[PDB]
Design a protein around this ligand. Structure first.
Ligand SMILES: Nc1ncnc2c1ncn2[C@@H]1O[C@H](COP(=O)(O)OP(=O)(O)OP(O)(O)=S)[C@@H](O)[C@H]1O
Ligand SMILES: Nc1ncnc2c1ncn2[C@@H]1O[C@H](COP(=O)(O)OP(=O)(O)OP(O)(O)=S)[C@@H](O)[C@H]1O
Ligand SMILES: Nc1ncnc2c1ncn2[C@@H]1O[C@H](COP(=O)(O)OP(=O)(O)O)[C@@H](O)[C@H]1O
Ligand SMILES: [Mg+2]
Ligand SMILES: [Mg+2]
Lengths: 338, 327, 439, 161, 282
DNA sequence: GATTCGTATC
DNA sequence: GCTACGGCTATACGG
DNA sequence: GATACGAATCTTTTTTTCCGTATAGCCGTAGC
């Protein structure tokens, strides 16, 4: 399929971008009997999930990647059907709170109660999406059923994880690779499939345009390769996500025009972005950082922007409707820049 | 088997004369009983003030032996929805008295947890069958009750327990359990009670447990502070002196040493400093605002949790910045 | 001995308090519905209470039914309180409809559903929906005309729970009928308005002169004019106006004249919060009465979204950015109070104060609109379906677990681009998920 | 039906005294009317309790059996000039008397909703502060410190900065 | 797409009773049922897709005439019909012989949504009264038929219990043992017990316990076997046990329970299988 | 409550 | 005289 | 002919209790 899973390191020894983390994983996998619950935190796209899969292969042998996708039904306190997908595999379970909202407590409760009845490893992607109640059940579920189950959850920015869960887990950090290592991985990819590659500098450009993201860099490489007729050019344009371009245009409009009509246009742009199912926290983050790369703003304007960004992202974290906080942040930026 | 019970449910008053503190309410309800007329009572006050004990003793005094069938007690533990009020309460307050004459007593313990529809149905039962039935309503929050229900109920306010009632109850407990209490420990116990008898009884039981040999051993203020884990007044005064007079490094060192000497909690120190600073005389009125606001958000953040050392440094900085306004 | 609104009921079409245009386009619809091949199957009338909805249908049936009836006069009104022995309650309306379907030729009679069955119970409400859906979709060659009158009233709060539905908040045609019934080719809807001051004054004057002796005996004849004007100004309900006039006339003292208070509409409340209300220059009193009388509408997240959407229409967006920033900051602060009444009070008070401070004469405001959040939710649902399809095809043709977060961030745009060149240069999903992002 | 006036309540009360023949004082009847706050049933209940508990109905006995309405105490607390007087009133009239903090917050919200002789901006700022305090009380922090901070912020917004 | 069949209850009693029992079971289980008309057997399926599935096999020799023709493989005509209409038709036809008759029941597939023309005769006493019925059905697609399959059962820990025939001396006692748990109103889970022969019905709850045990002779056709199932499925098992002489019970440890009923027509034997999932875990 | 278009009346 | 089955009724469920 | 008045438009997807239906259990009568 895509080049992201085409060159995904299946084994522990095939991971060659952290070194120290690989040695620590080998240390953990030396004696799996005393393996505690693991929590992996780091930048998105670093490869924490790849490390988890490699560790599971190092423990249970090859075969962890034999995923079967199943359909499960759950009932809340009231009569309701919850069609939750389960991607289980030998000695491995996958749960993600992306599809399920506030009902995320009962699904994980039933799943962990059924699986917990050697041990079976359970992987929870995006551990930050829990609503502080599934965490309340999970802490006791893993504290009492530690003999027949092990929990390995990956996440980024583990601040919304409650203190008891973080106390009940081993904290493992997965730093993003340097630009040279991403360039080396891209060089290996283009050695496996020749892409002409006129200059080595474009690989560094792709690495720098991803901010330490392997998945984004590989997607960029594949996009340029397919668009440039199975070739590459030194002057080939850098391809970026559409919502990044939309946010940059929104930043340009905010800097240029500061008025109520411009505020309504910004609200329409934010509504389009929300309708495209982009989370509002990262929308605020990208908008704030795109405002800070504007070279026509002084230091006082940047400080005001970052202060309003902190206030409004805290408000959005403690809020219900995301449009209010985004509109407030944009209006505060407009009232500060004028 | 009263020796096999917690001290809170061991010294529950059985007669009206055994209830201390609320002398006015006790005298008023006793006059009501002796005159033979009892209105629809409503008891309001903080927890542990003695409302349930008072109403239970009153019902026992009115019906000495017929308490089982002359008294219907419902609380939050039982369902008190619209159907229960419509059926069970009406059936109880619709039949004649068995042989005791007088009236039927219905006690609604913790009526603030009842739904609004239940109170709306209950008001007509109260004002309809009042010839042979009287209602008593106990609640800690009056905002959760319908204004009509408050209108048809005679309100009695249960004040927090004064000093003398606490002294008398503690003396009775000491006589019963053959225990000794220092006057300093007595003063410490009343201060931490906060007008609550249950807290006093629990702390006294924990202090008796703390002693290696209960008899021939007095309970001092050190025993109280060790059992309940509260800071001593001297520790609070030293911490406040270090924060107010000394520089930042030594104030932080003093706070850390005081907290690590006995494992004290930062919230208890915050409450102690708040209580001490209330007695202070501030001539700026901005120091008061800064202190109250900063300590309120710090206490709230502690309630939500977080970094403890950061919160302590925040307390020190807030106090210093607030007292910088007094110049 | 009889009520005035009952003893002075209209006897013909000319005595019905209704606008000429309303009479015309109800007459045309009813006449078209009596044709052998009528495009419209049923007639839906919506409006506030006492808007001559029921009576005008009666006076029209007095002149239309006797004309179209075959040779071999009134309506066949559904009566919900009839309890038949061998009839379950949900089957009563079905039996009524089946019996009334036999009213086509030589038995023609208009069907007037003024009081609907119990729609506050969900089972019979769905039964009503699927029963009137079958009437519109019936294969019957000809059916009797059906007229449904629904009174648009706000249901007051009864029980405390956040599972409140549309029927629980307000009693309107939108909450009762679903989208299929309302948007049907064989359904004609004629919304009604409250009776204007002119017809109310004319009919009150007619009622007064019909009892001239009784007002002249009580010396109230000279004071009847101001009473008529004030009653017509206060309310638009003909029944309430006639009842109040009868109460005033039969009185013998100086009791003040009082009428029922109509609820304030959603856009009416939005305009009151934004532009203020005339005859009330005190913002505190207006806000207090709005919260006391229309707490159901105010205590909703839809109202705050409406304020956020429509606050830019005060002067077509021609006001200082500081005021807009203050309004949106206050709304964001209110969003963090977990729906407390203090949040709504503070938000409305701040919006009203901000718009009052900058208010000037000669302002040309804009048109307010409903919030577009439901459209955003529908687009998000479509994006969710497309992302589920992408994750299913990516987990069926091969083994690759990607998170929905990564689908929205990168795989929603990069993967369609990969599938595009891969396909044209030569998987299933080729377009950007959720459509392209514009502006 | 409007709220009952003081004169009508006094007339009905005096009729009840004349029917029951109990001793009364004009100051006591005024106190009963003041505590009733236009509620006739409350006036009758308070009068009956006073007669059955103390006999002669004066201001002393009435104010010793029944309490002054807490909305008026809260209104006096909110309208205080300096923070020290408001803090003292709050403490000695709601905290030492045994009034729950949530009751104080709700009463403050109602009083601010029905508070005259104040500006709209000041009123909405105090409403926002009372709402924040209400949220803090509901979430669990129901100490006297929160009420003191609410009063401090109210006074800060009253006297500006 | 030409389906036609004729049923004579009086000519062959046992298979008609089997068909009536299958119809009663699928009606009691849930509304609507799946009728798979294979060219050599008819399979009646009740698929709720935890709740159980009933898979009854009816050979073509059961009916007097079994012309089944369709463009699909092996002339597979699959249809979904409401059990209540079919149950009412079967009750009418049963009362037809109960009042005294021997007329045959002719069923034809007369027209995706179709209907069966189930028509039969009745004679009161020498009068002719034609009973005509039309039950609306839907025609399941070929792929949709492929989506329905009989769940296979593992034999790693599954153990068979040969329940006594109801015609024997111990049959009535065993029927009483099976229905002994049905007389409790507040029962929702039955926790079975087999150790290696005894069958124990255990209903353990917060403040009451139940220990129904079978002390009579039992056979296991040729270790603990526990599975907890809902009470409603046990009612269906009891109903199936009464109508079948050859009843086989299979219990899987914390996996499932299988209620196998067989009718020895010898000839292909008619069989009824009721797969029951555990309501919850041990 | 605001805007916009159409009538009836003074 | 006994059993089966249909009709009436009390109770749990659902939305 | 100017103006007050009126119509059309500006819109939507936990907990308690209650209303009507489903269902199982038990009693009364026809038939074997
Ligand atoms: N005035 C008092 N005199 C003696 N013991 C008291 C007194 N008040 C409280 N107590 C003790 O405290 C215990 C608990 O008090 P209760 O009266 O049962 O509860 P409460 O005062 O009604 O508080 P709430 O609002 O119901 S939580 C009693 O059983 C007594 O042992
Ligand atoms: N001139 C008049 N024009 C109209 N109605 C009149 C008149 N004089 C008396 N009435 C009475 O006023 C009442 C108005 O009722 P309608 O508006 O026809 O009923 P409705 O529209 O269904 O209102 P609801 O929703 O049922 S309260 C009727 O009882 C009429 O008889
Ligand atoms: N050591 C490595 N060498 C090569 N590619 C890697 C390595 N680690 C991660 N990747 C690439 O990263 C991609 C996805 O990373 P992922 O595990 O999703 O990151 P995260 O766990 O942070 O979401 C994989 O397709 C894989 O090819
Ligand atoms: Mg109590
Ligand atoms: Mg009407």
């Amino acid at each position: 399929s895509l080049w992201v899973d085409k060159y995904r390191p299946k084994s522990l020894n095939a991971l060659s971008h952290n070194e120290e983390l690989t040695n620590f994983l080998k240390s953990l996998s030396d004696q799996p009997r005393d393996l505690p619950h693991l929590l992996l935190y780091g930048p998105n796209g670093t490869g924490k999930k790849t490390r988890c899969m490699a560790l599971l292969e190092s423990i249970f042998g090859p075969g962890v990647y034999r995923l079967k996708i199943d359909v499960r039904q759950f009932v809340t306190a009231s009569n309701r059907k919850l069609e939750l997908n389960v991607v289980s595999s030998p000695y491995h379970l996958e749960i993600t709170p992306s599809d399920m909202g506030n009902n995320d407590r009962i699904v994980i409760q039933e799943l962990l109660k059924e699986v917990a009845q050697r041990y079976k490893c359970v992987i929870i992607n995006e551990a930050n999406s829990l609503t502080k109640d599934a965490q309340a059940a999970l802490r006791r579920t893993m504290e009492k059923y530690s003999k027949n189950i092990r929990l390995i959850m990956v996440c980024d920015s583990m601040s919304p994880i409650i203190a008891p869960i973080k106390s009940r887990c081993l904290l493992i950090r997965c730093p993003a690779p340097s630009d040279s290592e991403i360039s080396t991985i891209l060089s290996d990819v283009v050695t496996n499939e020749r892409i002409q590659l006129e200059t080595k500098d474009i690989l560094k450009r792709i690495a720098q345009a991803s901010n330490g993201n392997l998945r984004v860099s590989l997607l960029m490489l594949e996009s340029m390769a397919l668009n440039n007729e199975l070739a590459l050019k030194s002057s080939s344009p850098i391809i970026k996500p559409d919502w990044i371009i939309v946010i940059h245009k929104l930043t340009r409009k905010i800097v240029k025009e500061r008025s109520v009509n411009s505020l309504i246009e910004c609200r329409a742009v934010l509504y389009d972005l929300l309708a495209h199912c982009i989370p509002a926290n990262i929308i605020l983050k990208e908008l704030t950082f795109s405002l800070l790369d504007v070279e026509t703003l002084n230091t006082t304007n940047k400080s005001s922007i970052i202060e309003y960004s902190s206030v409004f992202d805290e408000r959005l974290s403690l809020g219900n409707k995301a449009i209010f906080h985004l509109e407030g942040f944009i209006a505060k930026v407009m009232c500060c820049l004028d | 088997s009263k020796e096999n019970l917690p001290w809170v449910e061991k010294y529950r008053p059985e007669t009206l004369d055994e209830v201390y503190g609320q002398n006015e309410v006790i005298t008023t309800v006793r006059k009501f009983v002796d005159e033979g007329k009892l209105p629809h009572l409503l008891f309001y006050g903080p927890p542990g003030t003695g409302k349930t004990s008072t109403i239970v003793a009153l019902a026992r005094e009115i019906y000495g032996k017929n308490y089982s069938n002359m008294v219907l007690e419902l609380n939050a533990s039982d369902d008190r929805g619209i159907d229960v009020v419509r059926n069970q309460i009406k059936d109880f307050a619709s039949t004649r008295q068995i042989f005791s004459k007088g009236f039927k007593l219905i006690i609604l313990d913790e009526a603030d947890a009842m739904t609004n529809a239940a109170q709306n149905a209950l008001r007509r039962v109260i004002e309809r069958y009042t010839k042979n039935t009287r209602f008593c309503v106990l609640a800690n929050y009056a905002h959760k009750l319908t204004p009509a229900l408050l209108s048809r109920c005679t309100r009695f306010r249960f004040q927090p327990l004064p000093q003398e009632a606490i002294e008398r109850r503690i003396a009775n407990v000491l006589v019963h359990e053959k225990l000794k209490l220092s006057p300093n420990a007595e003063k410490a116990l009343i201060e931490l009670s906060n007008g609550d008898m249950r807290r006093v009884l629990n702390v006294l039981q924990s202090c008796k447990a703390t002693l290696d040999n209960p008899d021939e051993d007095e309970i001092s203020d050190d025993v109280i502070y060790e059992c309940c884990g509260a800071p001593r007044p001297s520790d609070l005064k030293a911490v406040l002196k270090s924060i107010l007079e000394d520089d930042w490094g030594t104030a932080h060192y003093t706070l850390n040493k005081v907290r690590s000497a006995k494992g004290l909690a930062l919230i208890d120190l915050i409450e102690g400093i708040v209580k001490i600073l209330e007695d202070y005389e501030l001539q700026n009125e901005e120091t008061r605002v800064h202190l109250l606001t900063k300590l309120a958000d710090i206490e709230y953040s502690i309630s939500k949790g977080g970094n403890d050392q950061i919160q302590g440094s925040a307390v020190i900085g807030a106090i210093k910045a607030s007292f910088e306004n007094e110049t | 001995g009889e009520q005035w609104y009952e003893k002075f009921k209209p006897n013909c079409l000319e005595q019905v308090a209704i606008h000429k245009r309303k009479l015309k386009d109800v007459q045309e619809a009813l006449d078209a519905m009596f044709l052998p091949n009528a495009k419209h199957r049923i007639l839906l009338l919506s409006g506030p209470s006492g808007c001559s909805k029921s009576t005008v249908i009666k006076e029209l049936s007095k002149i239309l039914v006797p004309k179209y009836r075959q040779n071999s006069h009134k309506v066949t009104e559904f009566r919900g309180d009839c309890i038949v022995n061998d009839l379950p309650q949900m089957e009563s309306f079905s039996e009524f409809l089946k019996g009334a379907r036999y009213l086509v030729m030589s038995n023609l009679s208009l069907i007037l559903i003024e009081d609907l069955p119990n729609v506050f119970h969900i089972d019979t409400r769905r039964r009503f929906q699927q029963l009137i859906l079958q009437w519109l979709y019936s294969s019957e060659p000809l059916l009797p005309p059906l007229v449904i009158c629904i009174t648009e009233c706000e249901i007051p709060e009864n029980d405390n729970n956040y599972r409140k539905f549309g029927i629980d908040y307000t009693f309107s045609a939108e909450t009762i009928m679903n989208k299929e019934i309302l948007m049907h080719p064989r359904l004609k809807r004629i919304k009604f308005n409250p009776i204007n001051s002119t017809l109310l004054k004319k009919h009150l004057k007619f009622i007064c002169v019909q009892n001239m002796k009784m007002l002249k005996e009580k010396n109230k004849w000279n004071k009847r004019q101001e009473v008529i004007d004030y009653i017509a100004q206060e309310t638009g309900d003909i029944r309430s106006a006639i009842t109040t006039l009868q109460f005033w006339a039969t009185s013998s003292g100086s009791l003040p004249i009082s009428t029922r208070e109509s609820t304030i509409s959603y856009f009416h409340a939005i305009g009151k919060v934004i532009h203020g209300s005339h005859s009330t220059n005190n913002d505190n009193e207006m806000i207090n009465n709005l919260f006391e009388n229309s707490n159901n509408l105010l205590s909703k997240e839809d109202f705050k979204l409406g304020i956020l959407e429509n606050y830019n229409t005060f002067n077509k967006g021609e006001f200082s950015i500081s005021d807009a920033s203050s309004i949106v900051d206050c709304l964001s602060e209110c969003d963090n109070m977990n729906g407390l009444p203090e949040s709504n009070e503070y938000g409305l008070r701040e919006v009203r104060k901000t718009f009052r401070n900058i208010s000037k004469q000669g302002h040309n405001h804009g048109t307010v609109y409903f919030p577009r959040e439901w459209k955003v939710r529908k687009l998000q649902n479509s994006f969710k379906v497309q992302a589920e399809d992408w994750l299913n095809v990516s987990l069926y043709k091969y083994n690759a677990v990607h998170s929905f977060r990564n689908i929205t961030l990168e795989f929603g745009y990069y993967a369609p681009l990969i599938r595009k060149c891969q396909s044209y240069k030569k998987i299933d999903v080729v377009d950007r998920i959720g459509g392209p992002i514009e502006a | 039906y409007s709220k009952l006036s003081d004169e009508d309540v006094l007339k009905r009360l005096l009729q009840i005294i004349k029917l029951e023949d109990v001793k009364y004082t004009n100051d006591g009847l005024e106190a009963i009317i003041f505590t009733a706050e236009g509620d006739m049933r409350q006036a009758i209940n308070n009068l009956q309790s006073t007669v059955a508990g103390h006999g002669l109905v004066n201001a002393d006995n009435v104010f010793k059996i029944v309490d002054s309405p807490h909305p008026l105490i809260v209104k006096k607390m909110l309208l205080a000039s300096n923070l020290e007087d408001s803090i003292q009133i709050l403490r000695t009239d709601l905290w030492k008397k045994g009034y729950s903090s949530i009751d104080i917050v709700t009463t403050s919200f109602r009083v601010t909703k029905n508070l005259a002789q104040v500006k709209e901006s000041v009123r909405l700022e105090m409403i926002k502060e009372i709402g924040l305090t209400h949220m803090r009380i509901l979430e669990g922090v129901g100490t006297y410190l929160q009420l003191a901070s609410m009063l401090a912020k109210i006074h800060k917004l009253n006297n500006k900065a | 797409m030409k389906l036609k069949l004729i049923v004579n209850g009086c000519e062959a009693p046992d298979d008609y009773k089997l068909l009536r029992t299958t119809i009663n079971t699928v009606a009691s289980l849930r509304k609507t049922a799946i009728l798979r008309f294979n060219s050599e057997r008819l399979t009646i399926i009740s698929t709720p897709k935890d709740t159980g599935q009933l898979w009854c096999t009816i050979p073509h020799d059961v009916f007097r005439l079994y012309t089944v023709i369709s463009a699909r493989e092996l002339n597979t005509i699959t249809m979904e019909c409401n059990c209540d209409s079919l149950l009412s038709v079967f009750k009418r036809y049963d009362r037809v012989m109960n009042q005294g008759s021997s007329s045959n029941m002719t069923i034809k597939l007369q027209s995706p949504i179709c209907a069966l023309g189930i028509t039969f005769e009745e004679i009161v006493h020498n009068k002719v009264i034609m009973h005509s019925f039309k039950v609306p059905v839907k025609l399941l697609f070929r792929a949709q038929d492929t989506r329905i399959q009989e769940p296979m059962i593992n034999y790693i820990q599954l153990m068979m219990y040969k329940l006594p025939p109801i015609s024997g001396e111990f049959g009535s006692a065993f029927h009483g043992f099976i229905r002994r748990v049905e007389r409790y109103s507040n029962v929702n889970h039955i926790h079975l017990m087999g150790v290696k022969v005894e069958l124990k019905i255990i209903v353990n709850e917060l403040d009451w316990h139940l220990e129904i045990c079978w002390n009579g002779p039992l056979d296991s056709v040729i270790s603990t076997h526990e599975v907890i199932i809902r009470c409603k499925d046990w009612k269906v098992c009891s109903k199936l046990y009464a109508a079948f002489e050859e009843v086989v019970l299979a219990i899987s440890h914390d996996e499932s329970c299988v209620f196998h009923c067989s009718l020895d027509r010898g000839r292909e034997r008619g069989q009824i299988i009721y797969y029951i999932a555990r309501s919850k875990g041990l």
